[PDB]
Design a protein around this ligand. Structure first.
Ligand SMILES: O=C(c1ccco1)N1CCN(C(=O)C2CC2)CC1
Length: 282
């Protein structure tokens, strides 16, 4: 079926939970043996969210190459994304090592450091120009260059230096700051505006390594971001945009990381975002 009318048909019939459970039942199951090794327990935020072995990002290290991060490679859309958990106190150096080694231009953050009164990820970037951060375990230096605070999101320019080679690179930090503590946003308008700002920066384009996108677990809000982006790109590429099937695209993405889209409300929000976004594109 088309999307907008399939949408109203699920609303009128109140069957979002049943649609979402079908997706959960059909989703791929692949091994995640490296994630579960005892030496990696303090590298995982949640025991039930792990990268598959076949798609995990490897750190360029011989001691321990593990990080909780996955490469989502969308062949028809010609887009790639790295989805990862919010960094932990003992993985902030690994996080920036990955950004460096994978040649990423942008980092997309969809959570606040504190939500619901609890810490959802480490404070992993510097908040003042004159107070830079050094990660001694991976030999990197990170400096805040500029910050632009808007009503729904903040964009930061960061300088990452590899202290071993003295090479430097400019990284863009795109921080969506207004996702509610509970539920999903009422309108997709600010989320779509944010997606378009990431696109306009070049961070999603083939001349760079894959964008790094995270929330707390790296599957819920993060899944919504890449699902919406890929579906809108396919609607621009195909002769028949009504042929784009958001459930099929989501199941393709779940071949590369488990659990993408965590609730039926996130599924409905993803539909809403693609529907409204397709009208603005034209
Ligand atoms: O593609 C874009 C776009 C291009 C340039 C700037 O934005 N958008 C904007 C937001 N959209 C909405 O429907 C908002 C609810 C108004 C549609 C998608």
């Amino acid at each position: 079926m088309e999307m907008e009318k399939e949408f109203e048909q699920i609303d009128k019939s109140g069957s979002w939970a049943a649609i979402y459970q079908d997706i959960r039942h059909e989703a791929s199951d692949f091994p995640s043996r490296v994630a579960k090794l005892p030496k990696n327990k303090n590298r995982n935020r949640y025991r039930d969210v792990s990268p598959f072995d076949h798609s995990r990002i490897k750190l360029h290290q011989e001691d321990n190459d593990y990080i909780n991060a996955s490469l989502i490679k969308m062949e028809e859309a010609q887009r790639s994304y790295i989805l990862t958990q919010g960094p932990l106190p003992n993985t902030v150096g690994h996080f920036w090592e990955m950004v460096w080694e994978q040649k990423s231009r942008g980092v997309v953050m969809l959570n606040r450091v504190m939500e619901k009164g609890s810490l959802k990820c480490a404070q992993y970037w510097p908040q003042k120009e004159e107070k830079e951060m050094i990660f001694e375990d991976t030999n990197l230096k990170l400096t805040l260059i500029s910050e632009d605070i808007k009503s729904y999101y903040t964009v930061r320019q960061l300088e990452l230096e590899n202290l071993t080679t003295q090479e430097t690179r400019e990284i863009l930090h795109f921080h969506y700051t207004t996702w509610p503590d509970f539920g999903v946003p009422e309108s997709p308008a600010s989320f779509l505006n944010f997606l378009f700002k990431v696109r306009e920066s070049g961070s999603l384009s083939p001349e760079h390594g894959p964008v790094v996108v995270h929330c707390s677990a790296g599957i819920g809000r993060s899944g919504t971001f890449c699902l919406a982006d890929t579906c809108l790109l396919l609607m621009d590429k195909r002769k028949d945009p009504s042929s784009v099937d958001i459930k099929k695209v989501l199941l393709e993405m779940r071949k590369f990381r488990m659990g993408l889209i965590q609730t039926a409300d996130q599924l409905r929000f993803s539909y809403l975002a693609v529907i409204e976004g397709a009208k603005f594109i034209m």
